[PDB]
Design a protein around this ligand. Sequence first.
Ligand SMILES: CN1CC[C@H](N(C)C(=O)N2CC(c3cc(F)ccc3F)=C[C@@]2(CO)c2ccccc2)[C@H](F)C1
Ligand SMILES: Nc1ncnc2c1ncn2[C@@H]1O[C@H](COP(=O)(O)OP(=O)(O)O)[C@@H](O)[C@H]1O
Ligand SMILES: [Mg+2]
Length: 330
Amino acid sequence: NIQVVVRCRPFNLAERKASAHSIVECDPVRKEVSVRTGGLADKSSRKTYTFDMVFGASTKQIDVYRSVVCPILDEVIMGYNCTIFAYGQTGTGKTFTMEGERSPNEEYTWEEDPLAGIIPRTLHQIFEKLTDNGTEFSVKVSLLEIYNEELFDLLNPSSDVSERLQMFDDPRNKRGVIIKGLEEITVHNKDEVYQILEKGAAKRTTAATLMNAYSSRSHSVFSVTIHMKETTIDGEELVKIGKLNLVDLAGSENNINQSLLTLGRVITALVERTPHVPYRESKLTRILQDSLGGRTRTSIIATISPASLNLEETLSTLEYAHRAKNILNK
Ligand SMILES: CN1CC[C@H](N(C)C(=O)N2CC(c3cc(F)ccc3F)=C[C@@]2(CO)c2ccccc2)[C@H](F)C1
Ligand SMILES: Nc1ncnc2c1ncn2[C@@H]1O[C@H](COP(=O)(O)OP(=O)(O)O)[C@@H](O)[C@H]1O
Ligand SMILES: [Mg+2]
């Protein structure tokens, strides 16, 4: 059930000018990825894997958004809960896929930037798809990040990062938590998206100075909750509630990341049909417990490098991502 797509990234300038030979190959139509585990391009040993979708270095943001995100957003907009994770080693494109970047030289507007990733495209699309149509709706976002088993709010402008939040269990709905003091910001219009992300980015900078390897070691959860009162062309009024969580995981490479470790152990228990699934063992899996063998529609985007130096890590990531194909939820 859980859908797992692989995204390979392009070689950088340091790799192009250093004449880099991709040890990776992608077959979208065959949904397959091949990794040369040794030897030459003349003759070689290769390892093959089959996923739910595969995107090669040539894949653009728009490609990923139309192919994977738009269908998930329609489900959220149907009153569903969905979650998408970006998993992979540092330098492979987790943040790039989830948030994207800006085109150089102030070339574009944030709505047009071909470099924009999932989070920005998604927030812009919600206001598109709903505004036109006859829908009443509010949009709330929160940005909850985990570093060394502590919780931070990257959107609260009244508090500074160093203030960690407390998490408790939800006495109402089992298998869910309440995070005390976490800000939920209302996005009044599309021209409110940008400044929200501007503020999160800003705070991220301070978090980064307060904590070592922050961008590499933290897990970030950006959630958009949609409240809709849709009045069909007829006159019916459907009240729906959707939540999409977008998770940029800490680098997969290997102190200890308890949330990463637990995540991997939760997948193992799920796919090996073990009675005990160790959710409670980390903040992340407690937060996102419903996304793992829960009533949530989840997708994993595994990001790999094409360079030869990263073979062991890309192998490790493919292997990890293949296994999660066997987790049944919803
Ligand atoms: C000086 N400032 C100029 C603007 C800058 N900025 C806001 C951004 O460009 N973004 C932050 C972001 C994002 C930030 C979060 F906290 C959480 C989630 C997210 F998706 C996405 C992108 C960058 O890839 C983006 C790329 C494309 C379109 C919009 C935004 C930043 F403020 C520096
Ligand atoms: N699919 C991609 N296309 C183009 N550049 C990419 C892609 N994936 C990653 N990159 C680049 O690789 C670098 C590290 O990427 P980043 O998104 O920060 O990854 P991570 O969050 O996994 O550590 C950045 O320079 C980003 O420009
Ligand atoms: Mg990152």
